[PDB]
Symmetry: D2
Subunit: 296 residues, 4 copies
Amino acid sequence: KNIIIGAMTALITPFKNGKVDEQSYARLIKRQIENGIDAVVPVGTTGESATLTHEEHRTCIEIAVETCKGTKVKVLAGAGSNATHEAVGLAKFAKEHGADGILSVAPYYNKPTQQGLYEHYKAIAQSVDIPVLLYNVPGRTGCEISTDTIIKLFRDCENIYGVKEASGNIDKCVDLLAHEPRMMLISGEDAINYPILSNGGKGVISVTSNLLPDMISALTHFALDENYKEAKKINDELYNINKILFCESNPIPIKTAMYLAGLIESLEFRLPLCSPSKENFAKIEEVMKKYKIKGF
Amino acid sequence: KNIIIGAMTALITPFKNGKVDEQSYARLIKRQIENGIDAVVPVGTTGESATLTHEEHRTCIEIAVETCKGTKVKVLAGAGSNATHEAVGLAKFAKEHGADGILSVAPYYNKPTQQGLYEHYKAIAQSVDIPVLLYNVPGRTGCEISTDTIIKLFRDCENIYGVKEASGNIDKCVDLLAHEPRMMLISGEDAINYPILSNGGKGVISVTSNLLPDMISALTHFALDENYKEAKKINDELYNINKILFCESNPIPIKTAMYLAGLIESLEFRLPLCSPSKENFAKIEEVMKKYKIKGF
Amino acid sequence: KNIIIGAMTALITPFKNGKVDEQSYARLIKRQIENGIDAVVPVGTTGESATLTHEEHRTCIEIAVETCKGTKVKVLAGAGSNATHEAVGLAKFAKEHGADGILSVAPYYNKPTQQGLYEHYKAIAQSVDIPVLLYNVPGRTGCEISTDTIIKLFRDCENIYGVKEASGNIDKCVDLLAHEPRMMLISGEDAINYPILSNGGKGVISVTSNLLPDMISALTHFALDENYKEAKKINDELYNINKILFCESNPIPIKTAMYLAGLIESLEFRLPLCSPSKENFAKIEEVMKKYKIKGF
Amino acid sequence: KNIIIGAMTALITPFKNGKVDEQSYARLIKRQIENGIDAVVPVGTTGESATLTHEEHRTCIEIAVETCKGTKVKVLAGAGSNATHEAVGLAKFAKEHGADGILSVAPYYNKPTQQGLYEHYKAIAQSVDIPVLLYNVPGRTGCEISTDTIIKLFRDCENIYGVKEASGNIDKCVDLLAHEPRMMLISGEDAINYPILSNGGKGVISVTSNLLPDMISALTHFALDENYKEAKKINDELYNINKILFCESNPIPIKTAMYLAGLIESLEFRLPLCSPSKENFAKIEEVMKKYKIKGF
Ligand SMILES: NCCCC[C@@](N)(CC[C@](N)(CCCCN)C(=O)O)C(=O)O
Ligand SMILES: NCCCC[C@@](N)(CC[C@](N)(CCCCN)C(=O)O)C(=O)O
Ligand SMILES: [Mg+2]
Ligand SMILES: [Mg+2]
Ligand SMILES: [Mg+2]
Ligand SMILES: [Mg+2]
Ligand SMILES: [Mg+2]
Ligand SMILES: [Mg+2]
Ligand SMILES: [Mg+2]
Ligand SMILES: [Mg+2]
């Protein structure tokens, strides 16, 4: 299978006067490229996919594709939806506009059965010829892609090559790779990046890397080179920021941190997201003081 | 406050050849009207809101409004979204096209904070002048509207008049009505309709009533009249069907039951929803046997 | 079946200088009798059954039996254990020493299967000829007595007559009484006393009644007479204290309130239970001012 | 600090005609010694601590001590209780009778606060001068020893040297060793032995090692020697058996396997534990056949 692995960033989507700040977006992506990242994920959960229109979503995929040209950095385009016809449309767009693969979140809110998830992802995978990474985040979607369903999809569809796990369930990560060791398990939970990598995970799709791209890429690359001692070191050092970036619902803290670091111009969300409490603002600012944040 | 209460049905959306079966939809609504239902909810969770387009969602709201004209039956239009700008667009549409009020589910997938939920619903309520019923279903959305948040919205926004609770949490139902007894608490969970009504709930938004409208309406009207012995007897009789209708994710069982009863022509969903297992199909058919199903 | 129902109190066990304060225990029981309580439960969870020796447990049952003689008040003796041979010993002691029935908590820590729970309670029920009330509290025991197992035990063992439920699950309470309406469902969760009683539950085993026995007794008897307006009003009034009495693990808050009320001499627990935090101490003190607390 | 780490076994307790089969108990330990195990845990959860009397509990500690005498293998005696005065008595007994250290499970059923857990373990640690390993298993006890509480106890009581974690929470394992890398984190959950060890955990207290001591000891020793490749390979091979040994509550499956393998003479439990279902019996037998089970 064609794969997209290594250190990856779930890019925040900056807003200015309620519109996507397209120049800021390209600048943030170039900062990722210059700090050792292997791929970027436009419009994942961290990019506020829910509140972008289908047009803004497509614009952000294009900006990512254009910005990574002339580099090794791949674009793993966010293309999931809880409606299969929407997810297929996003997948075809990503392929036709030069994305290297797609991320595809489990349908949220309508809770498909395992049979429905299989049919959902088969339809998506049959619509394009580029790699497809599943994405399990049950605390947000209300559903779980079972290990058996992930393995069946991996074996039955040529371009489905792995899963981003954001489930806080290392037992499930053992289950996945013990029964199907050819799949690419990708960490979607920064605090446990190293444990997932040490069990044979092959990359991360990170929130923290928005702020600290050099640290996440170093951790991932150490782990892939089997220097687990140094990968663990960075994972342990990052624990405090990894946790504080979820003191409120992601991406509220990471955008707060990017704004405090001077990396975006305004602390702007689209409703229903909004600024953190005054207390959590101060907590984020305090934890940032322990880390060295790269500029542009 | 202006209110919409009593026995209400979360309408299924019949599909045929992949499109909304508009005639069948109108006929199903007339069957509800003729069996004592007080309001209908087009395009809630049970109506597959996630997989309809915005144009089909609007078409179904229009069909409900047109079908209920000249009757006592109200239209409480499904209008929620996880993007506040989409939820405002749906609310304004419902108002402008003659809905009696709106239902508005808590944002799914993006997990807003309590402050964000407040701003989300404040924006929706300020955009129209018709009643707004909040809708809490944390197992599907990944977030919970707290009792404090519900009460503040009820007190701060003129048109927000209560909440549909689908959280299996009778403690919260006590919390709500003990601290704010003027709100309209509505059961969103058929198996516990009677406990919610007996604590001062004023209506239900039912899945089971799709199949058994006369029984749910009777349960509710007995309960509102304080004939608790008779309301409890029906709630107890309905327990088996109320639960089997969730053997797989709603609306897969209720549509399966409607098809088995001959009330819709095709057992069609939109992916990622799909037919139940062969085992659950048989369980649904077996439980239906002990209930008397009204035809057209 | 012989039954023990109505308003019942899970008695605290007062300590002084590390020993059971026997005189105080009898005094507290007399106060319960004089305030309309129908039964007292010595050495349940609220009575710190875990940290009493087998001898003290037996002393406390004996004091309760002595104190209720010549009154209408029954003794439903705490007799549970996670070891069946221990639970049978307590059951036989309770019978031989004149208890009217026994409460028997689901085995904690060792998590028996449903078959194991069935055989456990069958062994207990076969060992005595007095009423046995099962007791389900999964948040504390780590196991659940399923509705099917409760009903099988009720139907198969002639002295098992119902269940004390402390599970926050009104759906299960409907399930229980819809399939086996002859059993006595007893509320083990003060905040939802009224919803359980209004669904056909027949009593409460209360924590709050230690402090406010007259109010819990009135609620229960109103509800048993289907005077639901008055029963719900008291349940609503009691909600704030019912919840604050679990700001820390029961019985830490209720013992704190009894001490603040001047009903016991010293705020004494047996480790690992201990005095509450300073804030929760003040929180308990503040909610108490809203209620009228009977003296001796 | 003095420590007890490496590959350890939570010994089953065989029964014969309802009594501890002491001669089989010693033989099982000797088989563990012969297969590379570093320490044995008499009368933990897997040893049915709940249903042994205090005297049987003590007898099993004595057998372990005597059996391991003159060998390199240590005895980490189960000494926990939900009553602090009982846990202190067991701790002192183990010290006085030659145990190398004690395991002490968090109090079950009575749900102490974090302050209570601290005082509980401080009382135990101060009663002896041998190493004390905390033991967190919230699914069984109903309480959690927080990371902050574990770390304070480790830093404040010289003999407290680590924690056996059975919580399915690799994030917490990162939290623990990132903030206190000096403690000995011990896996109490066989399926995730390797991820816990790969993050710096220093041993396992295993259920599976009862049946396959050579495989669990090898897994642990590869990981301690930083051969993560081979430690993960064994962890992956063992996943199927590691999970099936919990198809019913531990130790119901492990005793069933020990009996099927001819290693214990009778499949006897003490109520409320009992034989597994016929189906689960069959599943266990089927999974065991894929592994090489050492004899005596
Ligand atoms: N990524 C850009 C599109 C975002 C659209 C949407 N807000 C809503 C998606 C939808 N399937 C739309 C249904 C509209 C008719 N009710 C949903 O809300 O479920 C989401 O997926 O979160
Ligand atoms: N109610 C008075 C007796 C209380 C005894 C005990 N503390 C411990 C019960 C026990 N079965 C004792 C096991 C002793 C041998 N390890 C347990 O701890 O599980 C409890 O049940 O909570
Ligand atoms: Mg640009
Ligand atoms: Mg996606
Ligand atoms: Mg009437
Ligand atoms: Mg004791
Ligand atoms: Mg009367
Ligand atoms: Mg030997
Ligand atoms: Mg122990
Ligand atoms: Mg265990």
